[PDB]
Structure formats: C-alpha cells, structure tokens
Design a protein around this ligand. Structure first.
Ligand SMILES: NCCCCCCN
Ligand SMILES: NCCCCCCN
Ligand SMILES: NCCCCCCN
Ligand SMILES: NCCCCCCN
Ligand SMILES: NCCCCCCN
Ligand SMILES: NCCCCCCN
Ligand SMILES: [Mn+2]
Ligand SMILES: [Mn+2]
Ligand SMILES: [Mn+2]
Ligand SMILES: [Mn+2]
Ligand SMILES: [Mn+2]
Ligand SMILES: [Mn+2]
Ligand SMILES: [Mn+2]
Ligand SMILES: [Mn+2]
Ligand SMILES: [Mn+2]
Ligand SMILES: [Mn+2]
Ligand SMILES: [Mn+2]
Ligand SMILES: [Mn+2]
Lengths: 303, 303, 303, 303, 303, 303
C-alpha cells in the first residue's frame, strides 16, 4: 500500500505503533520521551525535543538498504511508548515517574531509546538499570556532568552522572568524549578520576580519532548517553549551551558504531536537543538519524 | 491519574485514539488530515497544518467546563483517523484518495473534521457528501473560490467550490462570509450569483453583525468550510494570502455558533493554515481552539 | 549633554542607576526582576522577559512631555535593583529569595515594579506585602490563577493567588479582569467567588467598559498584577498561553489608569512576557511602555 | 498568454517595465525606491523595504476588478525607475541624488510613488516639488517629525518636514494624522502649530473619524507621506518604532481615499517599513496593497 | 560612475540586463529561473530560490579581480531571461513550458544558467539539450535521483535523471558526487550502474579528492547539475532534505573547477535551495557565489 | 553567596562593574562598546552586537579553571565603561566621540576591549593609540579593509585601516589573516603591500598554519582587530558579508594565542557581529568566548 511522506501521518518514533509503558507488548526497540527541561541553567526548549525527534524520525523509517546493497535493521520491530507523564516542578516526583516508566519499557524491549529532555533525565533513567552488572556509560558531551551541587541544587543537568553513581554501585565506569570549554568543575573532575572514569577531551578526537576508539570499553554492558552539544555547534546549533570545535556527525557516529560493535548495548538516551534554537531544523533531523544509525550498528553485530 | 501537559504525549487531534479511516470503529467526532498544499498559488506550508493543529489541539482537549461552571462535549467521543495517504504531485489521484477516506470516516462518525491543506481539498472532501439533500455550505473566507480556471488548471485552491458544484447537484447553496480585497474573478462572481449563492462582504459584518447572522441558512444540512484567511491577518497571520481588515476570532465564531444552532451540521474543514508563516504560534493555537469551540456549539444543539 | 539612543548603553529599567536590593539607597520607583519560568505549563521563555523589558524600556525613559505639552514623572526618581538571584529548580528556595529581595526593595522605594517571570512569582512577591491593611489586587489576565493544585504541584503559575491568600490574611480581595477561554478550574472560580473576589470576563469589558471601571476598587491599597496574556494575542503575541479576543493596549491602560486614580498603589508586577515568542519585538516594546505609562498615572494621582 | 504567479518573475513594482530615472519614457504612475535607513534612531531594516514592497506588489498587479464588477486603474500605465544610487554614509550627497532622481521621475509621470527608506527621505523627496503652488502634505504617522535637531543631527528621520518647510516656501500646510505615544518634542509641536499645520491625534480618529475627514484639505495640491508606523503594530509590526493603538488598515485607507477624491495628488511616499521585523510578511503585503488601493482612488477621481 | 550597494536596484542575476527568453539579445551567459517546488517530498520553499539567488548575486557582480590581481569574466556578457511562466499544478504543462524556455535561452547564449526549483526541473531542462553529442552530466548531490517511481509518480525530484535518460539517448553518462545517507533505492542504483554511470560517495571525496577529480570526464560536453544538499548542512542548511557530512564549499568548487577546465560546459542548474529554511541567509549568498565562481572557471578555459 | 545564571542580572561585559570612561576607576581589563553600523555596505545589525556580546559574556565570567585544574585570569580585574554616546549620522562627530572615549578607557586599564559595531569603528579606535611606538595590528578578516574610497565615502567599513595608517604614522605594520573571496580592491592591495603589510590568505592557514604563526610579530606592541567574518560562516553566520571556507574557531584562536604569547597586547576590538542574522545565538556566544579566551592567553604571558 502507499506510504506517507514525512509530513503525513501521526508522528511516532520511526512510525512505530503506539503503546503504553506497562502494556502487553514486546519489541526489539522501544522509544520513551522525557520532555523535561527545567533543570538546565541557560536556554530552555529541550522539553520540545521528543516531539521534534519523532517528527524528524519520519525521514528515517527502517529498515535501511545502503549504497552497497546491504540492509540493516531488517527484522527489527519498533514501538513508541509515548512520554513519561511529568508533573509541573516537583523534580523528585518527576524522577520517580521517569525511573518507573523506564523500568517498564526496558522490561518489554531489547534496546530502549530515551528522548530527552535536558541531561538531568539521565539520572532517573539510569536508576532503571540497577540490575546490569558492571554497567558502563559512554557519554558524548562537551561537559562532564559529574558535579555535586550547582546553583543550590543536587538535580541540575550538571549532576546526572554524579547522582547516578552514588545511587548505583553497579555503575562502575564512565567514558566521556568531547569535553571542551574554558571552565570545568575541579571537584567533579577530581571525583570522576578518583573513580577511574575515562575523560577524553575533544582535542584527543581531533588529533587522533583512532586513539579515541582505542580507549573505548570492550566486552562490557554499555549505556549510551548522547548530549547533542558534544557535536560542533555549526553542525547541531539547536542546544542550550554550545561550545565551539566539537564532534562532526561522522566522528560522533564513528565513536558510537565502534562501541556498539565491541560491547553489549543496553540502552541509549539523546538529550539537550533544543528545536526552538535551530530554525533550519537540521539539528533534529541529524540527531534523529543519529539514533537510527546507532541502532543499525547495534543490531548489525549483536551477540 | 496524572495528565500530560501540552508538550507531552503523541499529538493526535484532541488526544483522541488513532484509528484507520476504514477500521472497525465508531465515534461522535472524527478528525482526518489532508496535508496537501501544492494547489495554492503563493506561499506553501499548509501541508504542515494538520500536524500543527493536532499539536495545538492538546491545549483544547475535551470536554470543557466554562467560566459559568457548565460543561460542554461531555460524553462526546473522538477519534483521529490519521491523514489521507497522499502521493507526490498526481492531483487527480490525491483527490480520489481524499474522497475515499472522507467517505469512510463519514460513515463511522456523527461529525467529521477535516484538516487541510490548501482550500483545493474542499472539493474532494465535498464529493463525500453527494448524498446529502439540499446541502448548504457556510464558508468563512476572504476569497470566493468559485473560479473556473486559474493559471491553466481546474484544480487550484481558487476553484474548489466551482468544482464541487458541477460534480454535486445536491449542493444547492453556498453562503460565503468575509470577502474582501482589490481583485475578484468577475466570471466567478457572476457564476456564483447566478446559482443563487449568498455573498457576504466583510464590510457588511463590520457594519452590522446581527444582520449577517440573519442571512445564514436555517433548518438546512450544513457543511462548514473555514479558510483561516477569512480572519484578520493581525489575529491569524499564518496563511498564504492575507487580506487586511478581516474577522476577529469572536466574529467568525459567532457566525459558526449561529449556524450550528439553527442547522444540522454534517461536517467541517479548516484550511489554509500555514504554521511556518507565524513564528509566534498563535495562528495554530487559535484555529485549533476554533475547531473545538465549533464542536461545542454543534453538540449543544443535537437534534 | 548627548544621550544614548535605544541601542546604546547598559540596559537598566528606564535607564535608572543600578543598586543592590539591601543597599543604602532610596527612590520613588525601583525595579526588581525575577527571571523564573519553570512553573508554567506550556511554552518557556519568560525567564528572558526581565532583560527584554529593560532593553525595551530604553524607548520609554522618563520624564514624559506629552502632545499637550504637559510633563509627567518630572522629578520622580528611579532605581534598578537588578534581579533576584535564583537557584536552579528548588522552587521553595527561589520563593524565599524572591520574598526577601522584594521586602528590601519595598522598604527603599514608594512604588516597586516587579518584572517576571511566569505568574507563579506573584506569590512570593505578595508575601512581601504582609503589613498592608486590606490589601486588594487588581489583576489583568485571561486566566484566574486561583487553583489549589495543578499537575501535582502547589506552585504552578495557575496557583499564585491561591497561595498568596492562604499566606496573607490581609489580602482581602482580588479583582480579575480579562478572563476568557473554553476552560476554567470550577473549584478555583467558585472558591474565588465564595471569598468575595470580583471576576470580570473580557466579554463585560467589550460590552460595557464604563461598567467595568465602576467595579474597580476605590480608596484601597492596591497591588497591580499584569499578566500580558490578558491583552489580545494580536497585540501581544509573546506569551506562553494566548487566548483570542483580549484587551487592546488602550483598554488595559484605561483599567490601570482608573484604578491608579482612586487608590493607593503599593506595587506592580508584569508577568508572562515571552520575548522569544515574538520576533517582531512589539510585545516587549509595548509592555515596557505600559509599565511606564502606568507609573505616569500612579504619580499623577498620588496622595 | 499565461501570467506569472506572485513567486515568479523579476520583482518590479506592480510588475511594471523597468526604466531609468533620466531615460526616455512616460507613464501615468512611476515608482522610485530610496533604500536609505541610516537616519533612523532605533531598529534598521527599512533599506530593504523598496525590494520587499516590489515583491509584495506582485500580489497587487493592476488593473483591479472588484466584487461589484467595476474596474479601476484600467488603462493606467506604470513604470519602475528602480532605485536612487545611494552612497555609503554621506547624507548630504544622498539627499542631492534623491532630489535629482525625484525631479527626473516626476517630470516623466503624473503620479510618482516613492518607496523608502526611513522617513528622512521625505525631505530630499519634497525638494523635487518646489514648483507646486500651495503644496499640502497629508501625513499618516504616529510621530510628528517636525524636530529641528535630534541626537546632534539635522537630518534624522525626526526632522524631514522641518527641513522641507525651511527649504520650500511653497509647502504651505501639513496635516498629520495618527499621532500617539508618551513623548513629543515640545519645540517641534509649537513650531508646527505656529505655521498653522494641523495635528490630528489618533484619539480623534477613534472618537470621530468624520470630524477627522472634515479637516482634510479640499481642492489642493496634495503630497501623501505614509509612515507605516501610523498603523497599529498588530496590523503592521514591521517597523522600527511601533506605538500601540494605531490606525487599522481600513481607517488609514479611508483617510487616504477621502483626500485622494478631493484633491490633486502630486505624489506619495511609503516609509519606515522594516520587512526584517515581520517574519509573517504581512507588513509588506498589506503596505504594497495600500499603495495600489490609494492609486485606485486617485485615478478614480481625476478632474 | 556610482554603483548600487547589494540592497539597491532591481534584483536580476549578476545585476545583468533583463530580457525575454525569446527576445532580440545575445550574451555569453544567460540566467533562467524555474520556481517549481511541488515535486519534492518534504519541505517546500525552493520556488523562492530563483529570486533569493538573484538578490544574493548582487554581492557577486562580475568581473572579478582576485588577490593576485588577475581578472576573470572580463568582457563576458550576462543576461537574465526572467523565469519560466509556470501554471499551478499541471506538471506536464510545466515541463513543456520549461523545455521551451530552456531551448530559447540556449540559442541566445553560450552558457545558460538555470535556477531551480526542486531537482525535478533538471528533466525538462535537459530535454533542451537533445542535440548535444555524447552528453555527460556532472551531478553534485547527496542523493542519486535515478528512481523510477516514488509515491505514485514518475515526476518527483527523485527521478529527474531517470526521466532524462529514457528521453535522451544522447545522454550517455552521469557522474554523481557526494552521495551519502542511510537509504538508497537499490533499483535506481542498479539501473544507474547498468548504464555505466559513475557513483562517487562522499566518503571517496573525503578519502582521496585527487582520485575523485581523476574520475571526472575529460574532453566531453558537460552539463553541471548542482543540488545544494550535496554540500554539508552546516555550510548550506537552506535545503529540504539535508544529510550530514557533505561537501565543503571548497570541495564542491574544486570538483566544478576541474571539470570546467577539461570539458566543454554547455549548461548548469542550481537546485533545491530553500531560502526560507535558512534565516541567516548564508545558503543563498554562498550558492550565488558558487554559480559565479563556476562561471569564472568555465570561461578561463573556453575553446 | 549564590551567583546569577546567564539569564540573570544586568548584562555588563564579564558581569564586571559599570563605570564611566572618565570616572575614577582602575582595572586590568575594561570594555567599551561602539554601537555604530551605518558604515557597512550590506546587512545592518552590528549596532546591537555590543549588547549581544555583553549578554553572551555572562556564560564566560572570569576567572576560569580549565580541565587541567589550572586557573587563568585569577585576580585579573574587569570593568565595563558602557558605550560611546553616538549621534545619529554625523560620522565625523561619532569618530571624535569614539577616539576620546577610547583614550580615557585606555588610561584607566591595562587592556581595553572594544565591542563593535561595523569595522569602520577601528579607525577612530586606533587613533587612541597615537602614542604607541611602532604599533602593529594583527587583523583576522575575510577582507583587507585598506580601501581608499568606496561608494563615494572615506569612512566605510572597507577603509578603517587605510584611514588609521594615514592618521597614524606610528602604525608601522599590519598582518591580516583569513583573506578570501572573489573580489579584492587592487588599489587597496597595492597600497598595503607598498607599506610592507603582510597579507595572509585563508588558503595559507589551511595549507600550513605553523607557517602562518611564524609570520606573526614578536616583542611588539600589538592591537588585535577581530572581524567575525574572518571565521567560517558555518561557525559564525551572524555577520553582514559572509565568505565560505573561513577560520574555524580553533584556528582563529590559535592565531590570537600565538601573538599574545610573545607580544605586548595593547588592545583588541571585535567587530561586524550581527546577532539579528543568527537566530541560533551561537555567533555571539562563541565570539564572547573568543574575547575572554584571548584575555586568558594575554594575561598568561605578561612581562
Ligand atoms: N558539568 C557541568 C556542566 C554540565 C552542563 C550539562 C549539560 N549541558
Ligand atoms: N477565488 C479566487 C482566489 C481564491 C484563493 C483561495 C484561497 N486562498
Ligand atoms: N487559572 C488556571 C490557568 C492559569 C495559567 C496562568 C497563567 N498563564
Ligand atoms: N517627531 C520625532 C520622532 C519621529 C520619528 C520618526 C519616524 N519614526
Ligand atoms: N534518489 C532518491 C532521492 C532523491 C531526492 C532528490 C533530491 N533531494
Ligand atoms: N576591503 C574591502 C571590503 C571590506 C569590507 C569590510 C568588512 N566587512
Ligand atoms: Mn550533558
Ligand atoms: Mn553538554
Ligand atoms: Mn482564502
Ligand atoms: Mn479559500
Ligand atoms: Mn496569569
Ligand atoms: Mn494568563
Ligand atoms: Mn513614525
Ligand atoms: Mn515618520
Ligand atoms: Mn539531493
Ligand atoms: Mn537532487
Ligand atoms: Mn570582513
Ligand atoms: Mn573587516
């Protein structure tokens, strides 16, 4: 039968059927949105990212047959579990609802995809992976986000991984790639290193990408956390706090593809996208493709 | 339980459940989108209107308890039948698919709501009502849209009602309110008058609204066609061809309310909304409300 | 000597000298900003309003000599106390800081001007007026904002006056003008009415403005709360939740002028402006003028 | 044969043939642009107005057959003399080039149409009408623009008519309609009244439009000067310094229409349009139409 | 003699004299616009590209004297034949109108420059080159555009070269450079390879540009087709369907420069530019320069 | 205790205290804005750059502790001297106002930072350095700006350094890096070479950046002039006249860092930023950071 053009149809992620987090369904991949952006400290807009990503994903409906004739995501079913129902304010309640929804979705799919939302959502999201032994996180970001307190709060988008580690003893390591900028929280850097976390500055990527890939985990259970500001602002300008000289789409994708080829991917989140800050719409289009391309890599080599 | 905020959840019209035009369902109201805008002769964008209206409708989820404490649309069921699957180009095929979908939706609901799309969609939509005796159309528009041929085509957005009339002998009358502008197709005006159609210039609405309401049909089968450019550009700037000094939201709504109170409404379409032309977003927010408020009025007088 | 054009100089409200809330200063009028917008339920952006209003106020630097040759605000001194230092999240802490800064500013000026920020800021702002006998609030708004709980929180922008009344036994009456829309919280409306509050729908303003002015308070201590969405979206589109058919600038100004002529004005807040939602910039330009014109009226009838 | 749609073809005013100011041609109406905006004191952008107006005029190509079947501008020839070649800075030189071009275009048409550009262009433009006996100017504007010196200059957009009067003893009277705002130059107002100029505040138009029309000249040589900020900012937001509660399109047109039918119109300029400040594009669309409708009125009452 | 600044004068390509496609003129280079965008399957806007390109070209008026002091395009004459008069809808009629205009312009100049318009215009454009022996096409694009049918039509922007080949046996070869993305039409790829077409993925350009240049045709009659989406979205965001990691301006220009110095260039089109999708305006400014620089290279190697 | 988030507080550069140019203060670094943009020859907007840069600088408040734990600008004091009070038009008066303000600021700080404004401001700015022996200028720009006359004026943004040199024989040498484009003023290029100025095209940076750095001055009094269009438009699109293939932020910074490491930096200006042309806001965010990072380098190598 005829198929909808991108501007047609209800926008669900990858045009997947809609389901409830605690419903009776099962799928290889399931998306869950978290339209929460009140924890960021600059320009809001990320609450609109889940919807923008769903809309942009209509340009990337699986499966995909590449130029070389190979087809990826063949036989991979999808589901869109909608969005976590968030309260106004009440960060603690929002966190609990996010964790509960993430748990339910995780228990019904193989690889859950979480659409943020500012980076603070990664904390309650990760609480749903408490039973993953030696859980590792691979984070693309211009910022470390391992701060204890910022602007008198423990729940800002600058503390998700610090909060996650103190709540999850199974989260044994984090590899962050793309760090750059004039300012870094010394207490956060010290705390991350003290825990053996791997910090890879964007300088490393530029000088030797081959080496960066060489620093990625091997044979581990990995959770992907992609902060769109890890990418160069010229490529992805739609984000609150841009920092120059970031990852090209290709570099960020190469890092994700490599990690997904040598590890067991247990989930992925895409955060800090701000559609309202990029009127060209390329930010949401490229990031929706990023999620889909990452999934291609994952399922094209799973154990 | 908790409810989503406007920015949360999958955007279906009025958050109604998604169904297939020819699926096994029944509801009081059913929405059907027609993301077609290649027939307009100026600024494109109406193809994105159905999606924009669905998103905006999340701010107007029924039922409604007003300031006076009374509730409207209580117990009235809704369904979103998605969008007509349109081809690229191929206007004739597009028309056939639009009529087929509209027919299927019509047979399954009491009042169908069509989301355009440029005004040319009203022609194939009306074909789905060829069985309605003495069908009257109440049209809000700055333009008459009764032209025979324009820029070498019979299918432009300036010809929907002319096409509809020649194909539907049961379409016995059209009442158009809000006409204004420097240019009018003399052949179209003459043709409309000859068929006994009622033409109500905006100047008459400004001069005496009560008089205009008295010119509306009474005890007839009515199809509403709302071209957003009938409203003043200051109120609704998101449209291809704006004309100064149009209807305020209140005036247009009073006309729809009056007609809905004195006739049997068989359907309604909302066309020419161009979200891309109004970065403030008020155009879609207000027009989504207009559709919902019109339904409140329609169901307040169900015989 | 030469004076800056609007685009020159540091933007302080009315180009007034900068001071600290608890510093050693005194002035007739003092402005204080509250860049808080995490309590609204739709489109963010009001956190940028204080800055936008300051920039726009450079087009309205006092005193003003009108067409008739008469001068207003002559000799009236101004000061800009900057903004309340807000934390991230932590609504309760934010409230405490807002109340403290407001108290300090209030103690050093005759009429304090508060620039929001979403409407939730009116609650902590009003707490600074606990010592004002029989405090009356005159609120311009499309919404009532007298809700107890909304989306699982007590601190949303829909509850500021409910929170204020429970924290301030001296807040004996509220007059709200401009209400309109398909939905209202029935408990909020009934509670407000049962408390003796005056609700004036926009319909009444349109029907008989004189009658509305006659309903305003007289010989009372009055605090002005101006929610920009009380104004018609065509005039002021830059706001989160617009509702059609609102106050023209002239109508809103007549209401404020009337109240200022017959009462002791103790303060005023300007909330819900979202500069990011109006690329024409007219929203902040017109609202900055409203504040300045309101002050002209206040000081013209001060007792 | 076939005609271009608005988005097709080279944009010349009213789609008229292109000519040189000092070329060998003759026409009833001739357009001349003056992309000069370095004299305004706030938001630039008017330098692009001539081009925006030409593009917008493609929606208003003459002649016009209205709803009544009557045609206007039938047989009336048009020409586009392009723009004055302006230097960078060098206001004195720009003025001389403007006057020379205006003189040349004036000598080759019956009614010249000048597209600004900020209002300062009206001065060198008026210098080309030194031989018109008892010249009268009908100015639509929110401001008076009769200031002697502003920000240390004699050539700002606040001084065009003051400069014109001192250079043209034949300019015997000016009628300005639409004045509003909190500030007016007391010296400028006094100077205007001393010369017998007529000042009609927007309040007068609102209170009694009939009384306003009665103050317009009769049987005089009239030059129209339309500053788009005379119109309400909700209608025409694309302008540097908007002032609330202005003329609706209809009111401004009624004033121009009355004056056009009772006098010998020798010219007209349209200034202060800032396309860049109105992403909806309604400002240029409506103002291009304003010019064409004014012309319809002019040639509809030729002696 | 004084010359207009970019914002002055009537916008004709390269500020060249305006002429009719069938008029009495002759020039080395002639531009023809094709404001047709109803064939694309995503975001419209390309219909405004011809006009945007003309305006942007005022920043690149020939001749050009570089930093080395050498002058290019010296003595080369230009002309702007306006735009093809397109009907509404009626793709077949549009195609015929396009081919006829292309033929007329082709016979009055040496190198015709066609401004699109979506890519589907290349088909009717190429039909005007049926008499060119062993015609080779050098295509810059992220997409192949050799698809047979898409969304029930043979005339989408994904089929221009497929339609051109089955209609022009003299079209013996196509070299496409810049291909990338997750999805490629296997049937289209197979059909292209079966005809011996050269497919050069962006990866090859990145890996070895010298190798890519060595693959370009030599001593052949070449038609250049430049789809702006061949360039990286960071550089040229103004396009309907962007794909990450594309050609830099320099890389695309190097390809065109090399092909221009070793072949007989018979024409060039610039398609898919969507000015409405890039509010920074760099897309049209850079692409206008691309056409002009390509022309510099072309006439520096004419035999 | 707590500190403002970027959206909070009065926007002064680096959140530094506000002072008067001739006031009684002293600071290591002092900022002065020059909101002048009437000299550029294309798209206006730079007049708003000083304000945009100040706002953006709130994201770069000193001192800075990098990822390595080292802190820069520790103890370095800052001040914001506001903006030069500019007249409307009257370029010569503007120039004198600028030179005097710059001299006053220079005598109260070690390193003055000047915020433009179009590039023409560099001329009056440099006059404030008439007392510096063997003054060298390091200019990042896509254009040379050594033109004598352009569009009939001596004061355009294409002549700042030409004017500066003839007024300042002590300005012995200029090193311009980043030059590119199709057109260059041969007269300007010759005059610069004759004075021995070093011209470094962007191609040289791309080929061998190390070789470019080796060409920078050593042990000299250096004034930095950064024209944002020197950077690639993909990175910094907010500028009047962009040119493809420019400096990455990293490259521009490397050039500035190199010169600051072994020269006595006497001042720096940042010109041609046009915030209105980049709705993503990255242009001002990155350029504010550039200024701050340059200062970090400067004070890391003080003699
Ligand atoms: N790590 C401190 C700053 C992190 C900000 C988070 C995401 N933008
Ligand atoms: N009736 C001729 C013009 C109609 C245009 C249709 C809708 N914009
Ligand atoms: N009174 C309930 C809704 C109020 C919203 C507040 C302001 N927008
Ligand atoms: N009459 C003083 C102000 C005039 C400004 C001119 C036009 N905006
Ligand atoms: N080749 C199939 C897709 C082509 C789209 C055309 C231009 N964007
Ligand atoms: N050097 C001639 C052009 C310079 C323009 C200046 C800055 N944009
Ligand atoms: Mn992060
Ligand atoms: Mn980050
Ligand atoms: Mn219409
Ligand atoms: Mn219509
Ligand atoms: Mn409110
Ligand atoms: Mn409100
Ligand atoms: Mn004015
Ligand atoms: Mn004026
Ligand atoms: Mn393509
Ligand atoms: Mn293509
Ligand atoms: Mn430059
Ligand atoms: Mn420069």
């Amino acid at each position: 039968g005829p198929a909808h053009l991108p501007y047609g149809g209800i926008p669900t992620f990858a045009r997947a059927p809609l389901v409830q987090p605690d419903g009776d369904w099962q799928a290889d991949v399931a998306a869950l949105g978290v339209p929460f952006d009140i924890a960021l400290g600059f320009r809001p807009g990320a609450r609109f990212a889940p919807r923008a990503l769903r809309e942009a994903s209509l340009r990337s409906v699986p499966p995909f047959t590449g130029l070389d004739g190979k087809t990826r995501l063949q036989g991979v079913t999808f589901a869109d579990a909608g969005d976590v129902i968030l309260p106004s304010l009440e960060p603690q309640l929002a966190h609990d609802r996010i964790t509960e929804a993430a748990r339910q979705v995780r228990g019904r799919c193989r690889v859950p995809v979480f659409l943020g939302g500012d980076h603070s959502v990664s904390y309650p999201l990760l609480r749903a992976f408490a039973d993953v032994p030696d859980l590792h996180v691979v984070q693309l970001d211009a910022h470390l986000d391992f701060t204890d307190t910022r602007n008198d709060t423990k729940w800002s988008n600058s503390s998700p991984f610090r909060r996650a580690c103190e709540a999850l003893p199974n989260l044994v390591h984090i590899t962050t790639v793309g760090l750059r900028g004039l300012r870094f929280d010394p207490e956060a850097v010290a705390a991350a290193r003290a825990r053996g976390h791997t910090i890879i500055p964007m300088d490393d990527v530029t000088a030797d990408l081959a080496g960066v890939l060489a620093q990625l985990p091997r044979g581990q259970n990995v959770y992907f956390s992609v902060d769109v500001d890890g990418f160069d602002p010229a490529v992805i300008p739609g984000t609150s706090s841009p920092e120059p000289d970031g990852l090209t789409y290709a570099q960020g994708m190469k890092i994700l593809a490599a990690a997904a080829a040598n590890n067991t991917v247990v989930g992925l989140d895409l955060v800090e996208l701000a559609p309202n800050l990029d009127p060209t719409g390329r930010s949401e289009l490229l990031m929706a493709r990023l999620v889909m391309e990452t999934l291609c890599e994952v399922f094209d080599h799973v154990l």
